[PDB]
Amino acid sequence: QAYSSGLSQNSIISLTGNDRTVADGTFNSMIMPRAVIANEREHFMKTRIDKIEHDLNRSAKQEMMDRQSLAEDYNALNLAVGQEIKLDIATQHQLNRLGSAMYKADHERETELTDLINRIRENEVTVNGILENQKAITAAERADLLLEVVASTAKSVSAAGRAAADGSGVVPVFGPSVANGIKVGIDIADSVAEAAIAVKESGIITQLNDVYHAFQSVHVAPNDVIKPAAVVAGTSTELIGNLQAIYSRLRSHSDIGFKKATVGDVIPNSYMIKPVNSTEYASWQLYVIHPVQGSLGLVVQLMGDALTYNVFAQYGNTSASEFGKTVLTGGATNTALEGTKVKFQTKVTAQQALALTMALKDAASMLSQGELIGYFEQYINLALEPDNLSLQDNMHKYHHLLTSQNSPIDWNYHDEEMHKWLDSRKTTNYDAMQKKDGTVIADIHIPKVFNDLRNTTLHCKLEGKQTIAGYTVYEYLIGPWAHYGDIDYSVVVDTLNEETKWYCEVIGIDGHLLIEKSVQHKPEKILELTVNDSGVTSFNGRNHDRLKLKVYVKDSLSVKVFRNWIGINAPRVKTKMFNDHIGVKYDYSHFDKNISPAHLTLTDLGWHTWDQYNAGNWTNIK
Amino acid sequence: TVADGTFNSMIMPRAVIANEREHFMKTRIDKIEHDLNRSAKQEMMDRQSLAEDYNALNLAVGQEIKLDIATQHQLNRLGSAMYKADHERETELTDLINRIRENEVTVNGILENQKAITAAERADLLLEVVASTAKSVSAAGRAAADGSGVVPVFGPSVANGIKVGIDIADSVAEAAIAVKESGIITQLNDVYHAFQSVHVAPNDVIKPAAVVAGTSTELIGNLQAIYSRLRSHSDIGFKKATVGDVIPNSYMIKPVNSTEYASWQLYVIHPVQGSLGLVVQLMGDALTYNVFAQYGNTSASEFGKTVLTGGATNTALEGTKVKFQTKVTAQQALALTMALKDAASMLSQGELIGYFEQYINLALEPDNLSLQDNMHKYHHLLTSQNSPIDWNYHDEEMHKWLDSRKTTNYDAMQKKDGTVIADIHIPKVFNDLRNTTLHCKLEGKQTIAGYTVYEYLIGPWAHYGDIDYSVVVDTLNEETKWYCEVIGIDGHLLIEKSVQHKPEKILELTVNDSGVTSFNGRNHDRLKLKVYVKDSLSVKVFRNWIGINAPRVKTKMFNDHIGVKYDYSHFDKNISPAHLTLTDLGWHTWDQYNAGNWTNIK
């Protein structure tokens, strides 16, 4: 029996009309959605554009050159034995490239969400008025009004506007670009000499090459999330809690996606099955989505005018079939259909893909077959929301339901099950390879240091666009934490000058800490924090869920920040939900404050609380 | 040979603005193109060097350009890119004018005997008898031949990562002011997110110029007249960002639930580079338009007084609104609108919508040959002396309107916060594009005996006063010698400087109310400057007006261009610095040199 949600849905009027077929040479025919995966010309053009964006921001020549510098920095961290990140090994270098790019995009998205919270909290009175006065308008229209009363940097919710507002660092990672020119299948036969091991360390196995050719990261902008967050929000606190709840789920999926590459298994590929010789009025489509950043998959079937879907777990497969247990059913889907198979990479999460599938199922009678095909493929392949305003709102309402506490899917249960299954796979693959080949060969190809995106020791390069009296400001957001333990932070600063005086500022709820290091080309430890099982830390006597680090350098060239956990495979923290975020509230308004290194005296350095300063002039104490 | 009709649907023009994926796809390749040639990481790096060069020009107090302030740096990034792209197009126009003058006899024969053929065919024939570098008039060919500088400026990518909200409360400390200068107000952020520059290639302009031309002199005059109007509008576009107001955004209104047989479309164009706007309405097979002024608007209405009417347009229609950025000027958009009105009966409704939207969004000319001819004929009429629109009156009124807004906004902010905060957020130095002290980084692809040649074109000037030109040269080797050549009609002047990493003044010129200068006893409308440097890395040229807000020269029209003719044939010749001797430097007329050797005097 298909799952039936009692969600209220707006009526949908199709462009095709009562006869459910568009007329030739009409304005509606020109604005109709059309298939992108099925059409070869579009599926080729979009891959080329996706590759171009990756090479613009991340150049292989630059990343190959920075390997020597990055290896030295990781060595200088002085990690314990068994926790060292050796970038001289090819597999470790390849995994670091994937990890560093994925973390930078996740960090930037988290940074923008933090600023968006600050603008909402500053304008709480106006925001509260909008939410309660305007409850009948569409979710997209509510987002436009909310982004206007607050002085948001990105005030556009349209797809074209979001693309323009997005900058380098949030571009999805194109997997095939990373794994280009890397040697595969180096063969040393029964040799344990140092020369043979050196050659062995320079190559990767075929499995890692296959994993990278099927990888494409998904990072959701805050402007995308504000529409689901404001569908039923009544107060500003509820809206902020919804925004934080969604990004908690999103971040947890990103860590799982990186964990898939670390294990020795190959990741499945999303594909579409179409008839070999399509016949008019007898066509069918089958869509199989294996999201890399997720714990659940989707199978959608379009036979006639009927839409049927199934949600299957990506863990526990016996290798006899590519589908796990079914968690939510929406009809009967036949995955044994015979036809041409087309491979694609999804640009939306499982929660986003399912929301449109539920909305499309309710609109099957009111929408033509072509509209269902066009709207689904555009969103899966290009993250393009449907132009039908009523259908778009229905998708956002379902998106809120799948994330709320009353979701039909228990996301926490499935995410935890996926972590346990992935850990077992790594042990099985390592043990199997430890028998067939040596322990040394097993360590090269399956490193134990790389576990998940927010556990492995990773670096994040900082970009600087703000200059205060000659000092460039580099910003890094410490936290939030999905793991508990002891975490160390280090900063690497490269400057053209021979001798340089650079400063670091750590901002909390009440006061900030200012440090001076004056050491170049070597990591310098700035902060050591202890995170409890609830993900909060005690920074100068108060509980903090996140902090802000600002680095000031004169004539800077590159500033890197290293994040390090004391023990490998740090225990995880249960993912926060809406109730958890509402219960405890932290003020982030102080992250906007800045200091001027040039006008700094010796007494101003150290830990100082806000009451010691005047309004403004946070550099100099009274 | 009767078709089954499937082919004709494939060549049918498409609704790029209305269809979202088409609008998503175009934003992406326009962003990619801007980031390919202008890198944010590179621009942030050269901020320190540019700040030093601007400070080293020794400008008078009240005219200094301080790039340490975030607002001035952002406006410089927009100004330098806009001025650069306009400079290449002017250089290309001067080169084209030269080629026409060498082949006047052959060009005259084409213009007299090719009245029957299409405008595109005539342009292709004209560009073949001349040895033009670019010989393609198609849109696809023009994209291939386009260089790096002429790429349009993408506003949203420029204003990315810049801090907006900085709050110092009742604090006059030096530390607080330094933090305040590092940020920009929210108003400037909205200005950049709605900014896209349009630069028209000389190859696109030759079709309107040659459509009714009968002589080579008329063809040259038509080309110069169009670029006089085009350059004037680019200045207005930059001044719009300088004032404290927010520029409007072009948008299209479509029905919320469109019907198959009763659909309508309304287009509102707000060209940033222009003084007039266009509203086009498509109800059924009827097309109506209205040209409205972008100045004098009250708070209640976003439309000013309408100056040209083509029917009745209802701007209060209810429906979904889709924002877009135009790639054609108001004159270019108006030319197609008049052409589409005449051919409304002979064209399908899908053709009317597709042809209009492709031109505004992608600068694509219609595939129809009859439609193409009428548009280019209307383009010539709108830029001629008998134009229905008095462009000079509307351009001058926009200048007056923008100046009043700057004073009103600056005074309003001065009362609220103070003089210091007002100067940070509303700089008074920038003013117009050609007024502003700006730099133009130069690319050199020609090497003569180890010396790379960098070419700069002085003028034409839309403003009069005293102007200074300075050159900065950065080289890898220490103790180099670089030469500067300024070419005129009578001769050239050779200078040796041998100083690097600092600005060095090479020319001081005086321009009168007619936009002409006296260079060694002769009247010059423009001059060509060539800088020769060995093992060069970067060559930058600065221009500076002695006083702030220089008065404007009246925009030249067709009759003004044919009245006085200046020879630019000498701008092609160059020298070999390796073979220079001491007696060769200075001002030397051609009569002294031998034919073909302009390096060594007889």
């Binding site: 053209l496 000058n497 | 590179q42 050269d46 220490e478 890395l537």
Partner: peptide
């Protein structure tokens, strides 16, 4: 190579 980088590098050499 940028102008600032070239200017800074020449200072170190001298």
């Amino acid at each position: 190579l940028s102008e600032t980088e070239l200017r800074a590098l020449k200072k170190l050499s001298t």
